[PDB]
Design a protein around this ligand. Sequence first.
Ligand code: HEM
Ligand SMILES: CC1(C)[C@@H]2CC[C@@]1(C)C(=O)C2
Length: 404
Amino acid sequence: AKVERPANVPEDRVYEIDMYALNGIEDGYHEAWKKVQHPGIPDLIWTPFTGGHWIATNGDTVKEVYSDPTRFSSEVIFLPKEAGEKYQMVPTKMDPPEHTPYRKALDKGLNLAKIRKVEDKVREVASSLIDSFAARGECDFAAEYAELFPVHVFMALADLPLEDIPVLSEYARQMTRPEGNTPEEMATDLEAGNNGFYAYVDPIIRARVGGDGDDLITLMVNSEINGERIAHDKAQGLISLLLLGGLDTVVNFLSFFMIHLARHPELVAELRSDPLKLMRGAEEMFRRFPVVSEARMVAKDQEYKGVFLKRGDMILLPTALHGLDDAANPEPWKLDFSRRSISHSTFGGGPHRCAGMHLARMEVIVTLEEWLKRIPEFSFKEGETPIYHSGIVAAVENVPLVWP
Ligand code: HEM
Ligand SMILES: CC1(C)[C@@H]2CC[C@@]1(C)C(=O)C2
């Protein structure tokens, strides 16, 4: 399903790239994106796949598109456009100034200082999951840690009974990874999850208004937007985005770095010997394993990167192409915990820059600490290979790990 080349796209910028099926995906998500970014590739290219869209191809251009809501709007942030148009969320769809009060509400539950207080609960999630299989000498990391860890953290931050994990996990799967052989069946799957989650938190929102708790739900529902308490449905959208933001990004991120560490025993030893360098190299991991490739909509007609972009045009942002850009970071493939200038867009940029980034950093550091306390050496099961997918959030599964 290819679209005709528009008059604003120069023929010499056309690349046949399908963001949902990159060539060579089966050798690695990051590898597949990097093989797109050949030497001398224009800053902005264009593909007829996925409705037809531009693609930012380096760190400089990814950074720039993220930073400027005036020129590149969040009105549509994913591809294809007709799906992204149809599936907006609060406040990822807003530009400033509308966005601002909603981000302020988000920041109440996610700021650096608030996240510090939550470390004990996160650590306890990490240690319990790990304690399940540490004695076994083997596990599927994706299935037995990565897929479970985020939902458990959410329960703790949102103050929700742990026995609701099964129903919330079901809704999570449907909301983050819809299935369907028609876009209609896919639409059904998404609705199941979105409305199911809505029904689930609805009585908790109501019970928590005027409440004294410092969980995520009470913090969102008692936020003020423009001088008055946040609308019921807006608080619902926030709480939903809080579940979502912290799920698929982390599930997959965790596996990508555990895979690499399985295959790099000498880095594992390094981190084991130096827990200050462990703690301080979360940032290097974020650079090396980006997972998001969402989009911006061109907000108005304009010249950019030597082309004329039309209002309504879409620009795909492969965050892999900033972290792994050797113009941005010399020798980018090396996971280097002493790296001096760690340049990346793994959490976006501009006003929407991941509100969850302090939590992300803490989840990663704590996972790595708890893991190494119990499993100081490990590797990838012989004869096995991960399975990769490309899309809005990179997917990896099948991560059999083994240890003495
Ligand atoms: C590896 C971990 C993570 C990655 C790579 C990641 C990535 C991103 C990116 C690229 C954005 C910007 C979206 C845009 O501008 O359109 C974002 C936004 C957001 N993330 Fe994260 N995220 C991660 C973890 C988390 C966690 C743990 C949470 C906690 C729930 C979270 C919650 C959010 C929220 C609420 C936003 C929207 C902020 C806004 O629009 O102002 N994320 N994330
Ligand atoms: C995965 C997303 C594209 C979607 C909107 C922003 C993003 C990073 C999320 O937090 C959910």
